[PDB]
Structure formats: structure tokens, C-alpha cells
């Protein structure tokens, strides 16, 4: 039938099956024709053949569309705008800040002497002094800075760097007196120290107060299998990693993930273990003034394991300030007296039953700054650290999200504000006795976009079960709600992750060029309406997430925001569960489905990298009761029979290698959709990357593919 067909051959094992315990059925035998695509790309010629053919296939179709180059050109022109973070004060008396003059692959880190900061981010360029330029590390600029910490003394700088197609990293150290030079040559990291810390999978680095070494988590030496045997080690500056002192290993629970935080004073070390993706921890305190660093430290329980999470907020001698959800699912601030360990935690800021606490931090010595969630947006609240009493709101006039910078010792914070409409304003705030000094420090501006052409509405719609759901709707002020407009509708729905007002230039360009609407339904699974909003979109209520999303699409059609024939949907990772399911359950509703790094096989996820931890969210597919509710929606196992559904056009983004979400999820589902719908009529494509990111070039190329694919699929014309 189709001009673009047939689909590339995809090989089948007609005999591959697994038998699962079922509470309703005793057991269920599930056949997996495409189980051989669980074998990594590097380790199988079949997985290679599949990746290479599906890749060539998607490319010829994406590149046959003139609008693909159109979109690449538009995006390049427009993304060429200056981007910067808030200034970040450090122990070497410098503000450090991230900058991008426009189309550099990675952010560079610049710094400026504290007191000279009003010379930076001018028409002239970033000013200050370049400290670190990631782009210089690799020739292709895919080598990425994954995190960094300055020593207490201000003389050392520990940083993580990923290589391109890998999510592992090494930790390096360089003197703060050894910055990168603008005129260094590509493909190398000059003024670094010998220290190399390999076999790290995440950057959780804590210096001791003496600046002589740092704690880090690492794994055993090196695909696809579950991540096992996370250990905490202490490294001393100057020594080879072979010398690093073991602090923690739990050989019995190899799936657990562990790390350590020091309090600001660097006196108390908090060990936290995670056994799943829930906000619960096994959690110990040691006094570093009372202990050699090693396996023979005097640990004491902060609390019974697996009831709560604990984040250090500050310390006052033997008193430690914690942000915790201990008997507070929406989180609170409580103190712990290491000198009275039996007394447990004392509430300093009570849980708000109608607002999720996002963060707490100490500024101007005794000002507690709280970020809460209300109406799927951030509110900043100031408290007296000592009494806990309210001292008022700051930035009440801004609706969006904040990133706060400033330490307890500074009377100053730098606050990055952003929203669907504001790309980033760095404000400066100075605390006073009763009231503070706010000023606008710097504001990102985009040439070739008039932000005043756009608007964001806040609507409420009922889901299937009658739950009122909040949605943001961003669109050109001058499109008619006459039921003809296309929609790009984006979802996550899980892990207590709130969809905040977020700036995306690409998104606003999509609204302008396609006279389109950008819909963000705050579906259950998120924290937007506190922790119970997550509980009503997980495990056996996971279906509520899909229901909330369908109902959003239906509200937009009913209220004339959108053509019923021009609904595009989009989701990543856990949002890939949402897209694939909604595609299976309501293919009628959707004209285009974009799945990124998608989680799709809800029976097999626990077997791959970090998937085992997702069992707290989806349920345990090897549990007979859980199997039943998981199996009803498992997108990979719920592709509709081909006779009487027309599948929407579908495009799947994935790399060939990926630690976070194993690409076998995409591989198998694509393979299966194509096998089940061999003649289309709308194409199911897999857009592959042969280096897992991410350079700005990769990102605009993906976006060009995405938008060109949506325009084609929904028969939209680009406008000028």
C-alpha cells in the first residue's frame, strides 16, 4: 500500500516465551518474538542489522521532507541567543556562571572576582574569565561535564566527565589556579592534576573540611545487565585510586544505590541507601571528629530504615537541619541533635498539607528560604531559621520556576526565574532586617521572537473518574479557538515529577510556524498537587495517568482549542509509557506520537540497568497480583489487533547504547508495531543516534526530525 514501504525485515523467535505468576490466572505465558533485541547493539549482529536498517529507513523518510531542512535552518537561526545561569558564589572568592554565546555544543564555566560581578554578561560578551570549557575535551564536542565541587579551601576543583556514547564518568581534579585558556587546542584537558577516579555512574562528591580528599560512590570495573555493587570510597588528593579507602559496601543488596553527604561544617557524614525509586532511605550519621575514614566508623541510625528521605539543609554545631518527608509526605524541615540521637527529629517547619516542599536553604546566616509548589508553580517563602516563623514571600509577582544561588554566609542570593514565556531572568536579592533589596541583574533575550505574541492560560478539566486536572496552554495570542488549530501535548505522569512552566524556544517556534497550541496537562503521577497526586498515578492506579491525558486531549477538542485530526502527543522515559499506552488505548484521538528514550516493556524493565528500582512505581511484574494490573496496560503487550484500529503516525527516539532506559524497549515495540501494521497506513519509525547524549547540534537535528515528522503526519504547512 504505502509509497514509503515496505518496512525493513525484523527477525522473530516464534518460541521465546516467559511464564509469570498471576493472582487471577495462576500463571500466564507471554511470548516475545523480539526477545533477541534485548541483547545489546555491541554484543549481537541481529541488534546491529535491526538498528542499521531501521536507522537508514527512518532517515530516508525524515530527509524526503523539505520541511526537515526548513526546520533545521529556522531552529539554528533562532537558538543562536546568549544563555547563562545565575552567578554561584564559591570558596575562592569568585562567582562562577555557565555561559553559551549561542551555538556552542556545551555551556562553558566563567568566573569573576566577587565585587567585580557587574562587569559580566554585557553586550561585549560574558567578561570575567573562562575557567572551564567542556567543548575543548573532545574533537566532536560530545564529552560532557557531569558535575563539579570546589574544595572548602578554594584551591581544588573536582569534576566529572562522561565520554560520548557512555553514561559512566571519571572524576578529575584541577587547581582553581589552572583555568582553561580560550586558545587551548581541541581534544584534550590541559592544566589537570594526576588524580583520576574511574567506574563512577553519578557525581555525588563531598570534600572533607581539610580539603585533603573527597567521598564518592563508584561501581566495580567494566552491557545492559542491572547496575550492581554501588560502593562509597574516600579518595585523597595526590594518591592513585588503588589507594582510595573503602567506606561502604553491602554485598547482600547489590541493587541498592548508596552515597554520602557532609553537613556544611564538614563534621557529620550522612550515609543514605536507596533500594527503589521511592523517597525512602536507609540512613546513618557518623561524627568525622570521632572516627578515622573507613569501614570502622561509629554509625548511628538517623531513623528506622525505609520510612523517609533526608536531605541536609545546614548544621549548627551538633544540630543538623533536614528537609525530610518523615511523617510528612509533602515534606517538612526538622532538626536532629547528634548529641541527643534518641530524641529523633524535631519539626522546625511543619508540613503544609496543601503544598509540596521542593527545597529549603539557609542565606544571610539565619534566613530559611523555602520553595513550595502551588498551582503547578514555585513560591519562595522566607522563615527565621531559629524560631521557624514566617518573614514573608519574595518574587510573588513571578509565576514559573526558580533556581536559587547563595550560601548561608552571603546576605545575597542570585535567583534564575523562567516560565513558558520567560527564557531566564537572573535577579539579585539582599536580605535586610524586615525587608530585602531586589534588583534585576541580567535577562536572556532571543532575537527573532516577540514573547508578547504568546500567552499561557491555566485551565481545569475533569478526568474519566471526575478528578479536576490543571493544564497549562501556551499559544500565539492571535490564533482562533475555532477548533482547527493543531496541538503539541506533552506528558510525564510519575515519580512525583511536577511539569513546571519551562522555557523551550523550539516549542514557541512550533506554536508560531504551525499556528499551534502547546498543552501541558498536570496529570496524576506528578507532585503538582502534593505526594497523593503521585500515589493516584502509580502501581495499580497507573491507568489514571493515561486517563488524565486522554481527557486533556478530549477537553481541547471539545472547547475548540484543537482540531480532533491534529493532536500530536509527546513523552520521554516514563512519559514513553504514557505515549505508547495512550496510542494503544485511544489511537483514534492521536494523529502523531513522539516517544523519547521510551519505557515500553512493563514486564521486563526490572532486568535492565536501573529498571529494578522502578518496581516501586510500576509494581513488581514477578509478583502475581502486580502482574495483573501491569499486564492490562503494558504497552508492548497491548498493541491493538490490526483489523479495526488505524494506528497514528509514530516516531521513536533512542540511542543504540543507553544506561538510563535500555533501548531494547524501543527496539521490540517498533519491531512489533511494524509487524502488526505492515502496510501502515501511517508509518512507525525509529530515529537512532549512534552516540547517546548532549551537543546543541544533536538536539536541533532531533527537533527538526520531530517537528518535520509532526507537520507531515498532521498535514500542517510551515508559515512565511
Amino acid at each position: 500500500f504505502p509509497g514509503w514501504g515496505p518496512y525493513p525485515p525484523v527477525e522473530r523467535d516464534e518460541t521465546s516465551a516467559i511464564t509469570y505468576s498471576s493472582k487471577l490466572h495462576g500463571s500466564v505465558t507471554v511470548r516475545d518474538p523480539y526477545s533477541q533485541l534485548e541483547v545489546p547493539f555491541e554484543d549481537s549482529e541481529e541488534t546491529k542489522a535491526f538498528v542499521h536498517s531501521q536507522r537508514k529507513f527512518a532517515r530516508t523518510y525524515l530527509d524526503e521532507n523539505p520541511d526537515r531542512e526548513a526546520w533545521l535552518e529556522t531552529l539554528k537561526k533562532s537558538w543562536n541567543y546568549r544563555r547563562f545561569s545565575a552567578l554561584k558564589p564559591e570558596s575562592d572568592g569568585h562567582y562562577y556562571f555557565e555561559y553559551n554565546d549561542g551555538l556552542q555544543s556545551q555551556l562553558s564555566l566563567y568566573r569573576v572576582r566577587m565585587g567585580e560581578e557587574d562587569t559580566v554578561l554585557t553586550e561585549s560578551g560574558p567578561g570575567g574569565e573562562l575557567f572551564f570549557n567542556p567543548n575543548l575535551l573532545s574533537l566532536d564536542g560530545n564529552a560532557a561535564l557531569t558535575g563539579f565541587v570546589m574544595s572548602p579551601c578554594g584551591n581544588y576543583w573536582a569534576y566529572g566527565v562522561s565520554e560520548h556514547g557512555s553514561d559512566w564518568m571519571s572524576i578529575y581534579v584541577r587547581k582553581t589556579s589552572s583555568p582553561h585558556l580560550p586558545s587551548q587546542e581541541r581534544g584534550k584537558d590541559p592544566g589537570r592534576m594526576n588524580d583520576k577516579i574511574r567506574h563512577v555512574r553519578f557525581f555525588i562528591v563531598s570534600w572533607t573540611s581539610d580539603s585533603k580528599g573527597f567521598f564518592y560512590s563508584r561501581y566495580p570495573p567494566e552491557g545492559n545487565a542491572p547496575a550492581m555493587n554501588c560502593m562509597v570510597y574516600y579518595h585523597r588528593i595526590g594518591e592513585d585510586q588503588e589507594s582510595d579507602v573503602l567506606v561502604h559496601e553491602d554485598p547482600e543488596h547489590p541493587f541498592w544505590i548508596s552515597s554520602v553527604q557532609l553537613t556544611p561544617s564538614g563534621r557529620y557524614i550522612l550515609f543514605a541507601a536507596s533500594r527503589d525509586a521511592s523517597h525512602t532511605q536507609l540512613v546513618k550519621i557518623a561524627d568525622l571528629h570521632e572516627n578515622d575514614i573507613g569501614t570502622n566508623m561509629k554509625w548511628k541510625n538517623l531513623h528506622d530504615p525505609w520510612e523517609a528521605r533526608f536531605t541536609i539543609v545546614g548544621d549548627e554545631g551538633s544540630k543538623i537541619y533536614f528537609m525530610t518527608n518523615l511523617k510528612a509526605k509533602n515534606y517538612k524541615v526538622a532538626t536532629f541533635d547528634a548529641n541527643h540521637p534518641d530524641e529523633g527529629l524535631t519539626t522546625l517547619i511543619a508540613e503544609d498539607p496543601n503544598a509540596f516542599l521542593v527545597s529549603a536553604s539557609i542565606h544571610a546566616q539565619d534566613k530559611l528560604l523555602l520553595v513550595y509548589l502551588r498551582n503547578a508553580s514555585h513560591e519562595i517563602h522566607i522563615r527565621d531559621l531559629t524560631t521557624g516563623k514566617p518573614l514573608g514571600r519574595i518574587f510573588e509577582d513571578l509565576l514559573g520556576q526558580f533556581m536559587v544561588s547563595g550560601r548561608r554566609q552571603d546576605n545575597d542570593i542570585f535567583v534564575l526565574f523562567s516560565s513558558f514565556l520567560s527564557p531566564g531572568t537572573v535577579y539579585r536579592y539582599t536580605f535586610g532586617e524586615e525587608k530585602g533589596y531586589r534588583s534585576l541583574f541580567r535577562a536572556i533575550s532571543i532575537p527573532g521572537l516577540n514573547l508578547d505574541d504568546f500567552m499561557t492560560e491555566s485551565v481545569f478539566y475533569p478526568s474519566k473518574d471526575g478528578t479536576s486536572v490543571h493544564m497549562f496552554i501556551t499559544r500565539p495570542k492571535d490564533v482562533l479557538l475555532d477548533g482547527t488549530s493543531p496541538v503539541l501535548q506533552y506528558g510525564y505522569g510519575g515519580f512525583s515529577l511536577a511539569m513546571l512552566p519551562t522555557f523551550s524556544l523550539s516549542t514557541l517556534l512550533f506554536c508560531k510556524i504551525y499556528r499551534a497550541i502547546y498543552a501541558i496537562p498536570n496529570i496524576r503521577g506528578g507532585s503538582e498537587y502534593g505526594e497523593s497526586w503521585h500515589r493516584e498515578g502509580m502501581l495499580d492506579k497507573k491507568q489514571n495517568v493515561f486517563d488524565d491525558f486522554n481527557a486533556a486531549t478530549e477537553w481541547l477538542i471539545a472547547n475548540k482549542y484543537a482540531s480532533k485530526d491534529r493532536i500530536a502527543i509527546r513523552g520521554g522515559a516514563n512519559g514513553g509509557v504514557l505515549t505508547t499506552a495512550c496510542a494503544n488505548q485511544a489511537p483514534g484521538l492521536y494523529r502523531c506520537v513522539i516517544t523519547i528514550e521510551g519505557i515500553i516493556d512493563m514486564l521486563r524493565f526490572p532486568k535492565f540497568t536501573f529498571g529494578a528500582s522502578w518496581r516501586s512505581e510500576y509494581g513488581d511484574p514477578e509478583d502475581p497480583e502486580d502482574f495483573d494490573f501491569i499486564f492490562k496496560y503494558s504497552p508492548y503487550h497491548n498493541i491493538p489487533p490490526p483489523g479495526d484500529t488505524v494506528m497514528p503516525a509514530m516516531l521513536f527516539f533512542t540511542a543504540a547504547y543507553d544506561d538510563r532506559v535500555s533501548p531494547l524497549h524501543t527496539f521490540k515495540h517498533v519491531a512489533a508495531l511494524q509487524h502488526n501494521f505492515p502496510k501502515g497506513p501511517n508509518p512507525c519509525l525509529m530515529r537512532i543516534d549512534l552516540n547517546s547524549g548532549k551537543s546543541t547540534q544533536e538536539m536541533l537535528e532531533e527537533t527538526a526530525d520531530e517537528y518535520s515528522f509532526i507537520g507531515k503526519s498532521m498535514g500542517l504547512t510551515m508559515q512565511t
Binding site: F202, I204, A227, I257, S259, S274, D276, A277, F495, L497, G572, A573, N574, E597, I599, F610, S613, W614, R660, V661
Partner: peptide, 5 residues
Amino acid sequence: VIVVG
């Protein structure tokens, strides 16, 4: 701070 793509 555990692991969710």
C-alpha cells in the same frame, strides 16, 4: 537522586 530518565 536514585535513577529516573
